[PDB]
């Protein structure tokens, strides 16, 4: 039964090393488990000049290290049936291993060893450049994200926010063994790291294979600092790409978050789950309980469309994307901010219950799993500081009510200048003025 | 559209054909409808389908989350219309065929196989590993396979 | 902070806003004729009737 | 569209793949131009085409109503067009393949032949009798071919 099974969830172990980094795991009654570094390293803490080396770096964490180059590194890990996996965002990259329990310590060692002592063949970079350089190529094509980011490049514009994970074009065909050493050197540091897991394994045992392989101490204090980074300026704006020949169009509106400490984030995302997600698969069609979705359908509105929260250090973006085709764009805006408008004036108490509803089981969802949990973990720590509990986070959802929904998406969402991403045959969408308007009275 | 969507990744493309080009039936059907037959289904082959297969003799009512004791009160008094094993899946025959879809991509995908073994049987785990030992999916980010 | 609490308390609700005009308008005409009258008839100091009038009234 | 008539007599739909499975190429390809390149030839293409298999050598200059002299003087100082067997047809080769179009359809049409003989050959009008001995046309309206 509900509310005993969450007391039941055993409780996640955290003891930080006396060198900065720290550890973190959930154990359970599996055969199997996964762990990683979660590293609070990304694409803002880059700059101009360097813009794509968290991400040419994780192109390189896995072809050899010192101690074991390419083949036997490679040849270590598949050998053992181990999964080594791994991403980088603008505020987060991360490496992790799945394998049996059994493998527990001897793959912290690999861990360990990829972060610190990673080779950096200069001959094998000459050959992931051609390879990031496809990637773009091939990314440039995926509509959902180039829509993002150029979300971003003007949502923060002259901010490192504004900026790729993956750099420029011409960062990535200059960088050097160099700066790529550097990023390394002066971004993956204890302090700034979380070792987790999750599985088959005793915080003990796991604890101390840190402690040996994780050994490198600090003298000074300033090894001990956590960098503060330097806010980013949000920019009531819009940015839009016109191809004709493209044949759907994308769409992206938003406004600041609050960032990841702030507790409405909760109240925000019951929010986003009454105006849903939907693409022209749904089941429920003209009968779903999205307003934004039915209408879609009655309509014939868009293809797909989905609410995100997206959560930062100090900041956020709060909105929604649509595909659609180019003579729905507008209809569909329209309605999507007409949702939106409804929700600071109108939103029910049903509303509410059935958003709770939906983000409790969306919640348990992202924990399923060991890979998912050591996620969140090496998320909750390095981002909110403790790592919250699906008994916690539920309580502050099951206090959420209509009446404090309306108060803040009032407070992040009326009468607030957004920022637009418009991609593709957009003809129809036009003036911010008008898309600004929407921002109030409904 | 499913069908649409669907084969937005030729990887399903050739495993509708290759199923198709290795028998002759059963198991030599699509798994997604053929265009032809597209609205041309009628509410009682739905049925007569449903009311053919679906038989609990053919049915498992599995379930994680749950005491045994509950999901057993629901199966029984509850479940109708069961009581069978319906129809008989004609029997799979083998074929040996060779289908080409020529559309000018970049890409080729191409799957080439031969009779391999049957669920339960015993020479099963063989393939299973003789796949492993030939190698079949990664686990190393943007690598490669040496193993 | 009046820019502030203006956007906050009037500007805001498109209800409080027209509110304000209305209301606000009512103090508008009230002080802007006062004003306007005013200045004409000092412009015009002594020429109007208003002036002159002391000499015959009386009954 | 054009493709879309033709087609309207399946007598064209096996027609079409029966060559397709019958060779690998050359011969193998089809008279209608596939779907997927349909408005993705070029003018280039054209031209090229042109420049390249519609030359003298293998160009007749026919023609009836005409006297032989007339017919002649337009072919000379009007066709001045270059020489040479432009490019060669590669050797069509013989695969012995099976294709099939299920499409629910009352009847059915089918064909099945094997490598016969080329023009201006031997067997040629071995087949040509051959064909008549088992029956090719009717030659009485609404009847029966006793022959």
């Given at each position: 039964t509900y509310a005993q099974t969450?007391?039941?969830?055993?409780?996640?172990?955290?003891?930080?090393?006396?060198?900065?980094?720290?550890?973190?795991?959930?154990?359970?009654?599996?055969?199997?488990?996964?762990?990683?570094?979660?590293?609070?390293?990304?694409?803002?803490?880059?700059?101009?000049?360097?813009?794509?080396?968290?991400?040419?770096?994780?192109?390189?964490?896995?072809?050899?290290?010192?101690?074991?180059?390419?083949?036997?590194?490679?040849?270590?890990?598949?050998?053992?049936?181990?999964?080594?996996?791994?991403?980088?965002?603008?505020?987060?990259?991360?490496?992790?291993?799945?394998?049996?329990?059994?493998?527990?310590?001897?793959?912290?060692?690999?861990?360990?060893?990829?972060?610190?002592?990673?080779?950096?063949?200069?001959?094998?970079?000459?050959?992931?450049?051609?390879?990031?350089?496809?990637?773009?190529?091939?990314?440039?094509?995926?509509?959902?994200?180039?829509?993002?980011?150029?979300?971003?490049?003007?949502?923060?514009?002259?901010?490192?926010?504004?900026?790729?994970?993956?750099?420029?074009?011409?960062?990535?065909?200059?960088?050097?063994?160099?700066?790529?050493?550097?990023?390394?050197?002066?971004?993956?540091?204890?302090?700034?790291?979380?070792?987790?897991?999750?599985?088959?394994?005793?915080?003990?045992?796991?604890?101390?294979?840190?402690?040996?392989?994780?050994?490198?101490?600090?003298?000074?204090?300033?090894?001990?600092?956590?960098?503060?980074?330097?806010?980013?300026?949000?920019?009531?704006?819009?940015?839009?790409?016109?191809?004709?020949?493209?044949?759907?169009?994308?769409?992206?509106?938003?406004?600041?978050?609050?960032?990841?400490?702030?507790?409405?984030?909760?109240?925000?995302?019951?929010?986003?789950?009454?105006?849903?997600?939907?693409?022209?698969?749904?089941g429920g069609?003209?009968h779903?309980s999205?307003?934004?979705?039915?209408?879609?359908?009655?309509?014939?509105?868009?293809?797909?469309?989905?609410?995100?929260?997206?959560?930062?250090?100090?900041?956020?973006?709060?909105?929604?994307?649509?595909?659609?085709?180019?003579?729905?764009?507008?209809?569909?805006?329209?309605?999507?901010?007409?949702?939106?408008?409804?929700?600071?004036?109108?939103?029910?108490?049903?509303?509410?219950?059935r958003?709770?509803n939906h983000?409790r089981s969306?919640?348990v969802?992202?924990?399923?799993?060991?890979?998912?949990?050591?996620?969140?973990?090496?998320?909750?720590?390095?981002?909110?500081?403790?790592?919250?509990?699906?008994?916690?986070?539920?309580?502050?959802?099951?206090?959420?009510?209509?009446?404090?929904?309306?108060?803040?998406?009032?407070?992040?969402?009326?009468?607030?200048?957004?920022?637009?991403?418009?991609?593709?045959?957009?003809?129809?969408?036009?003036?911010?003025?008008?898309?600004?308007?929407?921002?109030?009275?409904? | 559209?499913?069908?649409?969507?669907?084969?937005?990744?030729?990887?399903?493309?050739?495993?509708?054909?290759?199923?198709?080009?290795?028998?002759?039936?059963?198991?030599?059907?699509?798994?997604?409808?053929?265009?032809?037959?597209?609205?041309?289904?009628?509410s009682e082959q739905l049925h007569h389908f449903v009311q053919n297969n679906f038989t609990s003799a053919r049915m498992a009512l599995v379930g994680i989350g749950v005491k045994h004791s509950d999901l057993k009160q629901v199966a029984e008094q509850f479940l109708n219309i069961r009581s069978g094993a319906g129809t008989?899946?004609?029997?799979?025959?083998?074929?040996?065929?060779?289908?080409?879809?020529?559309?000018?991509?970049?890409?080729?995908?191409?799957?080439?196989?031969?009779?391999?073994?049957?669920?339960?049987?015993?020479?099963?785990?063989?393939?299973?590993?003789?796949?492993?030992?030939?190698?079949?999916?990664?686990?190393?980010?943007?690598?490669?396979?040496?193993? | 902070?009046?820019?502030?609490?203006?956007?906050?308390?009037?500007?805001?609700?498109?209800?409080?806003?027209?509110?304000?005009?209305?209301?606000?308008?009512?103090?508008?005409?009230?002080?802007?004729?006062?004003?306007?009258?005013?200045?004409?008839?000092?412009?015009?100091?002594?020429?109007?009737?208003?002036?002159?009038?002391?000499?015959?009234?009386?009954?």
């Amino acid at each position: 039964t509900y509310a005993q099974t969450l007391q039941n969830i055993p409780e996640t172990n955290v003891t930080t090393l006396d060198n900065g980094l720290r550890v973190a795991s959930e154990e359970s009654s599996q055969p199997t488990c996964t762990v990683g570094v979660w590293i609070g390293a990304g694409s803002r803490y880059e700059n101009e000049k360097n813009n794509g080396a968290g991400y040419f770096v994780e192109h390189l964490a896995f072809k050899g290290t010192k101690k074991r180059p390419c083949a036997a590194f490679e040849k270590e890990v598949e050998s053992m049936g181990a999964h080594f996996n791994g991403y980088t965002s603008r505020e987060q990259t991360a490496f992790y291993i799945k394998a049996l329990s059994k493998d527990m310590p001897k793959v912290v060692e690999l861990l360990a060893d990829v972060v610190q002592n990673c080779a950096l063949e200069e001959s094998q970079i000459e050959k992931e450049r051609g390879v990031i350089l496809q990637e773009l190529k091939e990314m440039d094509n995926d509509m959902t994200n180039v829509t993002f980011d150029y979300l971003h490049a003007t949502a923060f514009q002259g901010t490192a926010l504004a900026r790729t994970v993956e750099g420029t074009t011409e960062n990535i065909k200059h960088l050097t063994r160099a700066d790529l050493a550097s990023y390394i050197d002066t971004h993956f540091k204890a302090p700034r790291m979380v070792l987790a897991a999750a599985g088959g394994i005793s915080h003990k045992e796991l604890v101390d294979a840190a402690r040996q392989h994780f050994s490198g101490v600090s003298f000074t204090y300033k090894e001990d600092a956590v960098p503060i980074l330097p806010r980013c300026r949000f920019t009531g704006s819009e940015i839009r790409a016109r191809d004709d020949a493209l044949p759907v169009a994308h769409v992206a509106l938003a406004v600041e978050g609050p960032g990841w400490a702030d507790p409405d984030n909760v109240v925000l995302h019951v929010a986003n789950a009454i105006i849903g997600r939907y693409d022209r698969t749904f089941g429920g069609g003209k009968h779903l309980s999205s307003r934004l979705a039915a209408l879609a359908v009655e309509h014939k509105l868009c293809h797909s469309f989905q609410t995100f929260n997206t959560s930062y250090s100090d900041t956020g973006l709060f909105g929604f994307h649509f595909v659609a085709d180019p003579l729905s764009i507008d209809d569909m805006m329209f309605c999507a901010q007409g949702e939106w408008m409804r929700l600071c004036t109108s939103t029910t108490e049903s509303e509410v219950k059935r958003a709770k509803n939906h983000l409790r089981s969306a919640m348990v969802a992202q924990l399923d799993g060991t890979t998912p949990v050591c996620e969140t973990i090496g998320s909750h720590l390095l981002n909110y500081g403790r790592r919250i509990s699906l008994e916690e986070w539920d309580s502050r959802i099951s206090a959420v009510d209509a009446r404090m929904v309306r108060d803040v998406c009032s407070k992040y969402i009326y009468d607030k200048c957004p920022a637009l991403a418009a991609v593709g045959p957009i003809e129809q969408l036009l003036d911010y003025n008008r898309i600004r308007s929407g921002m109030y009275w409904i | 559209v499913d069908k649409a969507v669907a084969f937005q990744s030729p990887q399903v493309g050739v495993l509708e054909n290759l199923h198709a080009a290795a028998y002759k039936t059963a198991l030599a059907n699509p798994l997604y409808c053929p265009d032809y037959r597209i609205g041309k289904i009628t509410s009682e082959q739905l049925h007569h389908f449903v009311q053919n297969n679906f038989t609990s003799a053919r049915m498992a009512l599995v379930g994680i989350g749950v005491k045994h004791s509950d999901l057993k009160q629901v199966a029984e008094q509850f479940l109708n219309i069961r009581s069978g094993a319906g129809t008989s899946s004609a029997k799979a025959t083998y074929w040996g065929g060779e289908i080409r879809e020529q559309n000018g991509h970049s890409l080729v995908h191409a799957a080439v196989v031969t009779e391999g073994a049957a669920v339960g049987s015993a020479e099963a785990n063989a393939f299973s590993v003789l796949q492993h030992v030939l190698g079949a999916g990664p686990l190393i980010k943007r690598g490669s396979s040496v193993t | 902070a009046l820019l502030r609490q203006a956007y906050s308390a009037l500007f805001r609700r498109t209800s409080t806003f027209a509110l304000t005009v209305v209301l606000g308008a009512v103090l508008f005409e009230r002080a802007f004729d006062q004003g306007a009258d005013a200045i004409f008839e000092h412009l015009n100091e002594g020429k109007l009737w208003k002036h002159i009038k002391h000499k015959y009234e009386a009954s």
